[PDB]
């Protein structure tokens, strides 16, 4: 239902190890599709999704060009920021920029973003109205004043409401079979003897797409009473995800515990139990 | 008068060609030479005052003299502000930023018509 | 032959207004200098205007919510325009609708004889 186009840009300064490292990563609906790294063999905008390869050299040229200007400007911005904060050049400093589109099932803009952080702390951000900025300190107030003088908020709002929305639609159709696909989770239950009278029952959910999932354990057909151990959803590295939920059950009580897998890629939810060999 | 040829931009009785195309430093100065112009030498603070809002970087007529061991303009002149590697060539942003880069890297450029 | 402080492109003079004005005041200010508020003829001109990388009120306007964008003199160029936001402005991302009452800079096209 909700759709998004986002760019995560990072410029991380080098302590004498040459120029700062410059990275741009493009995400369509929380999945990476393009990348720019100044540390790669020949810096250019590279495809990170098979469906974006459908773009001609005209697209890649335009984006490689935008990225090379961005890096130069982020380098200059790092040198300005060092002077503002009276910091030594001999240390690792980082400038981050996140901007993008949020559209609903209705192909219109819900919210636009344009925010920056210096050394992990918010610096300057565009308001929901997309007409004014929020500074955080003296340095960012100077940068707000500089942005105002070049009508940056209006420029960013123009991109956020226009090209960002329009391009997101192009990407959504370009990789529909992938973006809106449903990889059902492959679930199983492992048995781990934890104590002399206790056991860990781990319910795995593997190879699922999208990342949204609900894993829950039920004792005799009723929700958890004890503390349930659960890992933060992790990528398998192939496009699919992994997650597991575990419970410390008494020995001989394995059958009185049932696992429930809740994922959109499943017509009916999965009911799992530990299967002991005869 | 002070008019310019088709696709050129006139300002302060100077004719400028702002490239759409990306070219190497050598090929860019070779394109400027043919149009009886040269790469821009922005020794003046706000040479591209009309371009002041632009964040885009363009090749400029700057060369490192390995004999004098310092940066020099195509003119032979010595600059003074905004600057490092001798093997690199210089790009300039109308917003007054300066950046060094590989001379074999492709970039946009600005030709300034000679009298 | 344009004044020294101004821009000369394809036999037309261009200057930025000293202040950020409303759509009406921006149209009024250009007329007062024997020029017109920015109008787009070709993509080559639009791309050159996008090179300047400025926010500028454009001549293109609409009378209301359902009324169409108005521009004349048989120039086919009608770019994509992205409420009370009934006036079109030019940016680095192309033409964008905005509230006429909001103050933005403006560029005048003069075209001396």
């Amino acid at each position: 239902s909700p759709h998004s186009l986002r760019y995560f840009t990072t410029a991380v300064s080098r302590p004498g190890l040459g120029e700062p490292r410059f990275i741009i990563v493009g995400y369509v609906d929380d999945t990476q599709f393009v990348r720019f790294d100044s540390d790669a063999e020949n810096p250019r905008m590279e495809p990170r999704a098979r469906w974006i390869e459908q773009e001609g050299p005209e697209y890649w040229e335009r984006e490689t060009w935008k990225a090379r200007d961005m890096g130069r400007n982020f380098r200059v911005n790092l040198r300005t920021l060092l002077g503002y904060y009276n910091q030594s050049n001999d240390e690792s400093h980082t400038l981050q920029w996140m901007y993008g589109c949020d559209v609903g099932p209705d192909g219109r803009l819900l919210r636009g973003y344009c925010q920056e952080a210096y050394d992990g702390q918010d610096y300057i951000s565009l308001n929901e109205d997309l007409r004014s900025w929020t500074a955080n300190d003296i340095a960012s107030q100077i940068s707000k004043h500089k942005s105002e003088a070049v009508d940056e908020a209006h420029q960013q709002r123009a991109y956020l409401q226009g090209p960002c929305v329009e391009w997101l639609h192009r990407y959504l159709r370009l990789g529909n079979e992938t973006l809106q696909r449903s990889d059902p989770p492959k679930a199983h239950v492992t048995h781990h003897p934890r104590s002399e009278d206790e056991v860990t029952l781990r319910c795995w959910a593997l190879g699922f797409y999208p990342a949204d999932i609900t894993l829950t354990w039920q004792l005799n057909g009723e929700e958890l009473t004890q503390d349930m151990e659960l890992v933060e959803t992790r990528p398998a590295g192939d496009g699919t995800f992994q997650k597991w939920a575990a419970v410390v059950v008494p020995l001989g009580k394995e059958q009185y515990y049932t696992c429930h897998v809740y994922h959109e890629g499943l017509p009916e939810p999965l009911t799992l139990r530990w299967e002991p060999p005869p | 008068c002070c008019v310019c040829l088709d696709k050129w931009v006139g300002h302060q009785c100077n004719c400028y060609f702002i490239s759409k195309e990306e070219k190497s430093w050598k090929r860019s100065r070779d394109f400027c030479a043919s149009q009886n112009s040269s790469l821009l030498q922005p020794q003046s603070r706000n040479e591209l005052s009309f371009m002041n809002f632009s964040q885009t970087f363009f090749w400029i007529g700057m060369h490192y003299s390995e004999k004098r061991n310092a940066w020099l303009w195509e003119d032979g002149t010595v600059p003074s502000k905004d600057l490092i590697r001798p093997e690199h060539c210089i790009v300039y942003s109308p917003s007054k930023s300066v950046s060094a880069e590989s001379c074999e890297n492709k970039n946009r450029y600005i030709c300034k018509k000679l009298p | 032959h344009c004044p020294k402080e101004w821009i000369s492109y394809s036999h037309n003079c261009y200057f930025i207004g000293m202040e950020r004005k409303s759509w009406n005041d921006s149209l009024v200010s250009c007329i007062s200098k024997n020029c017109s508020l920015l109008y787009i003829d070709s993509e080559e001109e639009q791309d050159f205007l996008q090179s300047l990388s400025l926010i500028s009120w454009t001549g293109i306007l609409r009378k209301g919510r359902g009324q169409p964008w108005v521009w004349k003199e048989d120039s086919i160029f009608k770019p994509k325009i992205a409420d009370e936001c009934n006036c079109a402005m030019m940016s680095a991302s192309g033409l964008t609708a905005d509230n006429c009452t909001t103050l933005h800079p403006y560029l005048c096209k003069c075209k001396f004889p």
Partner: peptide, 9 residues
Amino acid sequence: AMAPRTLLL
């Protein structure tokens, strides 16, 4: 596609 501009701090 990416934004044509960034913030000049």
